[PDB]
Design a protein around this ligand. Structure first.
Ligand code: FQU
Ligand code: FQU
Ligand code: ZN
Ligand code: ZN
Lengths: 401, 401
C-alpha cells in the first residue's frame, strides 16, 4: 500500500491523462515537492561548483545527424518541422551544452567547466510500455557535463562519484549496486578512445572501493557508463545514476580550448545524472516514504489549530511567525473537534500539528503532535520554531523525538 | 549602450543559433537573471494567493481542436506525431490549466481558484520576424488562470490590477498606459454578458484609481480585456500586461463546479500575465538598465579583490562570509593591478567591488567601489554585508550612497 499513483491522487500531487501519454501535470502540492527537490539539487550544484544553464527545446535534425543521435535514436525521437527544416525535440542536453561552451574562446584556466541543467527531454517510448512516473515520455533530467583536460579526468570522475553517494544518502538510500557498461556494437569513436575511457571509469571504481560487474556491450553509443542502482525499503532495484566518459562528441561539435602549452586542444566530456529524472525520482520517493515525505519535502509542513475561537487570534499570530521563519504553514480555525482536525492533517501527511488551547495561549507555548502519533507536549513557541527550522534546513529524515 | 543583443553578448547572458531559431541558449549569468525573476514572481504568487502548477509540453491535437483556437492558430503551432496520433507543442497554458481544474469534483468553496505557471510555450513564428529576446519562438510567460463565479470577477480583476502596478514598480516603471478592449463584431455570449463584463473591468480599474482608454471593438471573441503598456526610461512603449475575461473556454473543455444551490455551474476564467514573455521582459530590462542590473538581479553581485598577494587570505575569508550571507560573490585573486580588476568588473556591471589592501586587512574593514565609479571608502565588513543583504532583500533599484 505505497503506490505512487494512489498517493499522487490522494494527496493531489499530480495526474496524467490519455491526451498526453507519459507526461505529467503537477498540481500545486506535487509541484511544491518538485521545486524543493530542485532547490536541493541546486544546493549541490553550488557545493560541487557547477554552472547552471538552459538550452533550446528543439534543434535542427542536421545537428543531431552530426552528433550521431539521429543514426542511433531516430525512431525514438519526436520531430517537428518549420519552413522546410526538420527539428528534433531534444532527447538529451549534451549537444546544447557544447553549443554554450563553444561561445567565447576557452583556455585551460576555464577547466574544469561543470555545466548543469534541469533538462526537459522527450523520448518517443512505445505507449504500452509507459507506467506511472517510472517510465514516462516527457521528463526533467538532473543533467550536467564537465569539460576538462585528460589529466583532470581522475579528479572529476571521482567528484561525480562522491556527488552520487552524497545525494542518495540524503534520502536514506545506502544500498547501491554499480555496473560498468562497455563498448556497444554500434558506436562512435576509435577503439583507443574506448580503451582509455573504459580504463578510467574502472580505475575510479577501484579507487573508491566500489565493487562492480561489467555489462558488456551496454555502453552508450558515445561512451562507457558507470550505472548506479539504488534499493528502496521493499528491496526493489531502481537504476538512477550514470557517469559517462566521452571523447567523441566534443570533437564532432568542434569544441576546443587553448592549453598551457598554447596548443589548441579538444576537451574531454564527462556526462552525469544522479536522480535520473525529477519525475521518476519523485515517484520512487513517494513509494519509499509512502507519502510521509521528510519535513523539508512536505507540501504543508505545519498546521496550527485552535480548540475554540478563543485561541483564534493566537493561532493566526503563530501561523504568521512560522511563515516568517520560512515554514510552509496553514491555520485550521474550524469549529471541529480536535481529534477530527488532527486526523485530517495526519491523513494529509502533515509532519507537525500545532495545537493551541487556553493553557498554550497563557504560557506563550504550543502543543506539538507528529503525524506518526507522538505527543511532544507543550513547548515554548520559539524553541519549536528553531527546532523545525533546523530539521528543514538540514534536510533531516527524522522528525523531533 | 542600450541594445540588449550587444549587452547580452558582452555580459555573457545568452546566445542564439540558426540550429534553433528563436530559442534561447541561456548561459550561466543570463539564467541567473531568469531564475531571480522567477523567484520575484513566486514571491508575488504567494502574496496574491496563487497556486503554482506545471503542465506537459504537448497534448493531443484532438483536445486543442475543442478549445476554439485551432482554426485561428493552426499555422503557428508546432506539431509532432507518435503512434498515429498528432500532438501540439503548447503555445499557451490555458487548456492545460483547465485539465488540472477538471481533476476532482470542484465546489463553489474552491473558488476563486488561482492557478499560475511559468509556462514553457512555443510558436512557429516566421524566422524573418525573430529578434533577440523580444521576438522568439520559445518563450515562458508569467501566466495564470483564475476560475471564479460571475460575482467574483470584479474583486479578482481588482487584485490583478494591483499586482500589475506592484510588479512594474519594482523595476522602476511608473508610467503605464491602460486600454480596455471592447466587444468585437464576431463574438460569443449575449450582449448582456458583454455589458456586465466590460463594466466589471471598468469598475475594477476605477477601484484602483486608474484612468484608461477604450480600444473599441478589439476584444477577443470570448471576452473583453485590459492591457497594460509600460514606458521605459527612453519613453518607449512596451505592452506587457494582460487581464482577459473568458466566457468560452470553460464550457468548451467541460469545466464545472457544484454551486451553493447544488447546480452544475460553469466557471468564468480570467487569463492574466504581468511581465508577459519573461525572455522579452529580460530584454526590456537589459535596455532599461543599460546592463546595470539592480543588485538583486545582477548575475555577480560582488567581486572581492586584493591589491597584492599579501591580502589573498583576507579576501578568501571575506568571500566566504559573503557566500554564507547568500550573496553572489566571486574572488578576483589574479596578480593584476587593482585598477585593471576594477576596470574589468566595472565593464561587466558588477554592482560592488570590495577592495582589500593592507590598511583594510589591518582594520578588519573593506574599501567599497561601485560600478558607477563611486568610492564609498573603508567600511566595517559586517556593516557592509548587512547593507548588501538589505539592498538585495528589498530588491532596491538604488545602490549604497
Ligand atoms: C547523463 C546524460 O548527460 C546523458 N547524456 C544521458 O542521458 O545518459 C543516460 C544513460 C545513457 C544513454 C541511454 N539512452 C539511450 N537511448 C536513449 C534514446 C532516447 Br530517444 C532518449 Cl530521450 C534517451 C536515451 C538514453 O538515455
Ligand atoms: C495571459 C495568458 O493566459 C493568455 N492565454 C495569453 O497567452 O495571452 C497573451 C496575449 C493574448 C493571446 C492571444 N493569442 C495570441 N497568439 C496566439 C498564438 C497561437 Br500559436 C495560439 Cl494557439 C493562440 C494565440 C492566442 O490566443
Ligand atoms: Zn549527456
Ligand atoms: Zn490563457
Amino acid at each position: 500500500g505505497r503506490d505512487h499513483r494512489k498517493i499522487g491522487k490522494q494527496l493531489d500531487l499530480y495526474h496524467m491523462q490519455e491526451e498526453a501519454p507519459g507526461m505529467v501535470f503537477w498540481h500545486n502540492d506535487g509541484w511544491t515537492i518538485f521545486r524543493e527537490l530542485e532547490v536541493f539539487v541546486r544546493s549541490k550544484l553550488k557545493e560541487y561548483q557547477y554552472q547552471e544553464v538552459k538550452g533550446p527545446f528543439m534543434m535542427d535534425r542536421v545537428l543531431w545527424e552530426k552528433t550521431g543521435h539521429w543514426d542511433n535514436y531516430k525512431d525514438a525521437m519526436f520531430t517537428t518541422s518549420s519552413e522546410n527544416r526538420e527539428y528534433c525535440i531534444k532527447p538529451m542536453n549534451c549537444p546544447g551544452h557544447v553549443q554554450i561552451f563553444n561561445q567565447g574562446l576557452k583556455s585551460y584556466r576555464d577547466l574544469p567547466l561543470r555545466m548543469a541543467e534541469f533538462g526537459s527531454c522527450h523520448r518517443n517510448e512505445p505507449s504500452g510500455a509507459l507506467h506511472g512516473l517510472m517510465r514516462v515520455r516527457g521528463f526533467t533530467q538532473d543533467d550536467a557535463h564537465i569539460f576538462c583536460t585528460e589529466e583532470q579526468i581522475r579528479d572529476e570522475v571521482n567528484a561525480c562519484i562522491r556527488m552520487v553517494y552524497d545525494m542518495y544518502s540524503t534520502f536514506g538510500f545506502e544500498k547501491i549496486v554499480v555496473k560498468l557498461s562497455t563498448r556497444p556494437d554500434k558506436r562512435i569513436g576509435s577503439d583507443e578512445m574506448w580503451d582509455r575511457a573504459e580504463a578510467d571509469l574502472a580505475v575510479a571504481l577501484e579507487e573508491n572501493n566500489i565493487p562492480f560487474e561489467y555489462q558488456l556491450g551496454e555502453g552508450a553509443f558515445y561512451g562507457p557508463k558507470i550505472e548506479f542502482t539504488l534499493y528502496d525499503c521493499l528491496d526493489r532495484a531502481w537504476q538512477c545514476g550514470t557517469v559517462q566518459l566521452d571523447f567523441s562528441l566534443p570533437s564532432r561539435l568542434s569544441a576546443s580550448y587553448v592549453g598551457e602549452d598554447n596548443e589548441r586542444k579538444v576537451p574531454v566530456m564527462i556526462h552525469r545524472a544522479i536522480l535520473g529524472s525529477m519525475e521518476r525520482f519523485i515517484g520512487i520517493l513517494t513509494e519509499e516514504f509512502a507519502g510521509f515525505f521528510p519535513t523539508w519535502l512536505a507540501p504543508v509542513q505545519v498546521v496550527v489549530m485552535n480548540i475554540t475561537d478563543s485561541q483564534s487570534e493566537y493561532v493566526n499570530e503563530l501561523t504568521q511567525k512560522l511563515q516568517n521563519a520560512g515554514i510552509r504553514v496553514k491555520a485550521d480555525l474550524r469549529n471541529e473537534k480536535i481529534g477530527f482536525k488532527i486526523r485530517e492533517h495526519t491523513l494529509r501527511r502533515v509532519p507537525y500539528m500545532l495545537v493551541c488551547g487556553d493553557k498554550e495561549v497563557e504560557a506563550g507555548k504550543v502543543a506539538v503532535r507528529t503525524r506518526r502519533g507522538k505527543d511532544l507536549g507543550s513547548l515554548d513557541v520559539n524553541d519549536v520554531i528553531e527546532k523545525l527550522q533546523q530539521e528543514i534546513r538540514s534536510r533531516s529524515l527524522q522528525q523531533l523525538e
